[PDB]
Amino acid sequence: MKRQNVRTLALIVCTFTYLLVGAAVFDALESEPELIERQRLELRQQELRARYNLSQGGYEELERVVLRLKPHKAGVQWRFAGSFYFAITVITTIGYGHAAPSTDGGKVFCMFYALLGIPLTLVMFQSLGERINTLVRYLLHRAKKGLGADVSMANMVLIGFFSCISTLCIGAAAFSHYEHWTFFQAYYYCFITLTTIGFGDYVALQKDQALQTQPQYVAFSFVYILTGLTVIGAFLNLVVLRFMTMNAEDEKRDA
Amino acid sequence: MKRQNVRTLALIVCTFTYLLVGAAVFDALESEPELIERQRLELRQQELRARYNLSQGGYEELERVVLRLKPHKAGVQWRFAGSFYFAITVITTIGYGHAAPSTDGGKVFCMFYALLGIPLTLVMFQSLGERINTLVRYLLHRAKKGLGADVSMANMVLIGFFSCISTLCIGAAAFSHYEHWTFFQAYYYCFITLTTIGFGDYVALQKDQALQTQPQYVAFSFVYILTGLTVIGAFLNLVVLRFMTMNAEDEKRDAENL
Numbered sequence: 001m002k003r004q005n006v007r008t009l010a011l012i013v014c015t016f017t018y019l020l021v022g023a024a025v026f027d028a029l030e031s032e033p034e035l036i037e038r039q040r041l042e043l044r045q046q047e048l049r050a051r052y053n054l055s056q057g058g059y060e061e062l063e064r065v066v067l068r069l070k071p072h073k074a075g076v077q078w079r080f081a082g083s084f085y086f087a088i089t090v091i092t093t094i095g096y097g098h099a100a101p102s103t104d105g106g107k108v109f110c111m112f113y114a115l116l117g118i119p120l121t122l123v124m125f126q127s128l129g130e131r132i133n134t135l136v137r138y139l140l141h142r143a144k145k146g147l148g149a150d151v152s153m154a155n156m157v158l159i160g161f162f163s164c165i166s167t168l169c170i171g172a173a174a175f176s177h178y179e180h181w182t183f184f185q186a187y188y189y190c191f192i193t194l195t196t197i198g199f200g201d202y203v204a205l206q207k208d209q210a211l212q213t214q215p216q217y218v219a220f221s222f223v224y225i226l227t228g229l230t231v232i233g234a235f236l237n238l239v240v241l242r243f244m245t246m247n248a249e250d251e252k253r254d255a
Numbered sequence: 256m257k258r259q260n261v262r263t264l265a266l267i268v269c270t271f272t273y274l275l276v277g278a279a280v281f282d283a284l285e286s287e288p289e290l291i292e293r294q295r296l297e298l299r300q301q302e303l304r305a306r307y308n309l310s311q312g313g314y315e316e317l318e319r320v321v322l323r324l325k326p327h328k329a330g331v332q333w334r335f336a337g338s339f340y341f342a343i344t345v346i347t348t349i350g351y352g353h354a355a356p357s358t359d360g361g362k363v364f365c366m367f368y369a370l371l372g373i374p375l376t377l378v379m380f381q382s383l384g385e386r387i388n389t390l391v392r393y394l395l396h397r398a399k400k401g402l403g404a405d406v407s408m409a410n411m412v413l414i415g416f417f418s419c420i421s422t423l424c425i426g427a428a429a430f431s432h433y434e435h436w437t438f439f440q441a442y443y444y445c446f447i448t449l450t451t452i453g454f455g456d457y458v459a460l461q462k463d464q465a466l467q468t469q470p471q472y473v474a475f476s477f478v479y480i481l482t483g484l485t486v487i488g489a490f491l492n493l494v495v496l497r498f499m500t501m502n503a504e505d506e507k508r509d510a511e512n513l
């Protein structure tokens with residue numbers, strides 16, 4: 001069997017077994033607490049329904065209003081700052097879902113915007129990320145000869161890995177201060193943001209109408225998300241990206 | 256100025272102006288309808304508070320319970336099928352947020368799981384995507400000689416672009432049937448899923464306890480998300496990926512000549 005076919009089949013087996021391992025671990029850690037939380041909340045639902053004399057339909061009518069008011073609770077999500085924050089989540093593939101296009105036309109433009117945007121943003125982060133790696137490579141080379149010279153891959157992975165933790169820590173310290181979260185909650189938010197997972201369980205600028213009332217903090221969160229993705233993007237360009245073109249290189253080697 | 260530095264500065268200017276254009280368009284399409292729905296919902300909030308004799312604190316107490324019961328409403332989100340669906344959203348960077356780690360330990364494991372998982376899944380989709388492109392290149396070459404031969408980039412972009420639409424069309428057809436959405440809503444869901452945006456406004460397997468009661472549809476949903484990301488990932492490997500190594504190639508070209 002060809003090297004390309006062995007590498008591909010191994011990766012498929014690895015990904016599927018990694019999914020089976022993950023599903024097994026996430027079951028052990030989250031199955032029992034979810035069952036505990038459901039029964040606890042159902043007891044709280046029955047207690048408050050009895051306290052405020054509510055029927056099955058009576059609770060359900062109030063249930064729909066509370067759920068539909070959730071994106072409005074954070075404030076105006078669609079003005080210039082609201083739409084700029086949303087535009088980021090689309091092209092950077094974060095997509096928290098805190099604000100989503102409610103209109104048919106908005107949904108269409110969002111698709112066309114993503115089609116051209118996502119590749120443009122991806123190429124931008126890999127290009128700027130490479131310039132940072134080249135600057136780091138030059139600065140380290142100049143520092144090596146300065147003290148009394150060759151920059152290795154291992155030195156680049158070390159600086160790269162530390163730069164990623166530093167970006168998560170600088171962020172965590174700031175988001176725990178402004179969004180009033182714990183350092184761990186803010187660290188978890190920064191991880192999920194910069195890895196483009198963006199669950200939406202933690203979203204910045206969604207407290208005390210920050211998008212319209214706090215421009216200085218909005219300016220920082222836009223700068224942090226963009227600079228942070230460049231730091232992670234630089235590490236991907238250095239370590240991850242080289243394994244994606246691997247199949248094309250072996251196909252060229254075969255010819 | 257160097258070619259690498261001009262290309263990087265142009266991309267930064269392009270991305271920021273694309274953000275300003277987007278923010279301007281999303282303002283025009285969503286500002287007025289959001290203001291309309293907020294005022295409509297605030298009146299409905301006041302109406303139902305008056306109907307069921309609710310105070311400021313009374314509504315707020317019921318508000319917390321309704322919000323906390325939202326992930327439970329869809330059913331059991333953390334059994335084998337629920338956790339497998341969640342594991343997908345993490346490593347594929349979709350992350351709908353329909354189900355999120357409620358425990359401190361679950362949040363930690365998710366971070367470690369993502370750290371190794373995301374690069375593994377990304378490399379897997381680019382590797383399997385390349386094998387699909389190579390198979391398509393071979394099948395077209397054999398078909399060309401069959402009718403009476405050289406496969407160009409333009410032919411590959413055409414087949415690739417059609418393969419992406421067909422995946423969204425097959426998907427929308429299924430998701431509008433099982434998740435009872437419109438073809439457009441299911442097409443929008445498929446687009447947002449396969450582009451790894453994953454807002455969470457549309458999430459499959461969250462209707463009629465599908466994760467625990469419908470195994471056949473769960474198996475399809477996992478297969479579609481995984482095969483669909485390979486189809487999109489193949490097109491990226493063909494068109495987008497070549498522009499990422501561009502700066503490294505010019506840096507190598509600078510060293511070679513000098």
Ligand SMILES: O=C(c1cccc(OC(F)(F)F)n1)N1CCN(Cc2c(-c3ccc(Cl)cc3)nc3ccccn23)CC1
Binds near residue numbers: 092093125195484485
């Ligand atoms: O899964 C895919 C995929 C695979 C097939 C198709 C497809 O569809 C399409 F690309 F079209 F959206 N996406 N990814 C491709 C896009 N992103 C990559 C990405 C990262 C990143 C990556 C990994 C880590 Cl650990 C941390 C940050 N950061 C950014 C910032 C802006 C833009 C993109 N970033 C996520 C991975």
Ligand SMILES: CC(C)CCC[C@@H](C)[C@H]1CC[C@H]2[C@@H]3CC=C4C[C@@H](OC(=O)CCC(=O)O)CC[C@]4(C)[C@H]3CC[C@]12C
Binds near residue numbers: 014243
């Ligand atoms: C902190 C983060 C950013 C680190 C990311 C680590 C990656 C660089 C790792 C994670 C999984 C690894 C892959 C896991 C499995 C394989 C199959 C393996 O295949 C073989 O050994 C058979 C073919 C051959 O001999 O080439 C080749 C390496 C590869 C792609 C690995 C390449 C490196 C990967 C992408």
Ligand SMILES: CC(C)CCC[C@@H](C)[C@H]1CC[C@H]2[C@@H]3CC=C4C[C@@H](OC(=O)CCC(=O)O)CC[C@]4(C)[C@H]3CC[C@]12C
Binds near residue numbers: 216
């Ligand atoms: C290369 C990097 C380091 C610099 C890029 C330029 C920044 C200085 C720009 C890019 C985006 C800008 C932000 C885009 C949007 C807004 C919202 C704006 O707020 C409003 O318009 C409030 C009313 C509304 O929401 O309509 C205030 C400025 C701010 C934070 C901008 C501040 C300046 C920012 C961060």
Ligand SMILES: CC(C)CCC[C@@H](C)[C@H]1CC[C@H]2[C@@H]3CC=C4C[C@@H](OC(=O)CCC(=O)O)CC[C@]4(C)[C@H]3CC[C@]12C
Binds near residue numbers: 116261265266269
């Ligand atoms: C349907 C989807 C998947 C199509 C994706 C289209 C991409 C292939 C496009 C979108 C934005 C484009 C970029 C927009 C701007 C530039 C800057 C441009 O820079 C210059 O012209 C100056 C330097 C030089 O001359 O090389 C080089 C091409 C590049 C990276 C483009 C490369 C091709 C990109 C990534």
Ligand SMILES: CC(C)CCC[C@@H](C)[C@H]1CC[C@H]2[C@@H]3CC=C4C[C@@H](OC(=O)CCC(=O)O)CC[C@]4(C)[C@H]3CC[C@]12C
Binds near residue numbers: 477478
């Ligand atoms: C290379 C490709 C084309 C094939 C990959 C193998 C598939 C046939 C596997 C991979 C993941 C599997 C799924 C993983 C999880 C589940 C949930 C499982 O449901 C339960 O365990 C219900 C109870 C619970 O939630 O704990 C039923 C089988 C199913 C759909 C599996 C069916 C078979 C799947 C789609």
Ligand SMILES: [K+]
Binds near residue numbers: 095199454
């Ligand atoms: K997301």
Ligand SMILES: [K+]
Binds near residue numbers: 094348349451
């Ligand atoms: K993503």
Ligand SMILES: [K+]
Binds near residue numbers: 093196348451
């Ligand atoms: K995402």
Ligand SMILES: [K+]
Binds near residue numbers: 199454
């Ligand atoms: K999300």
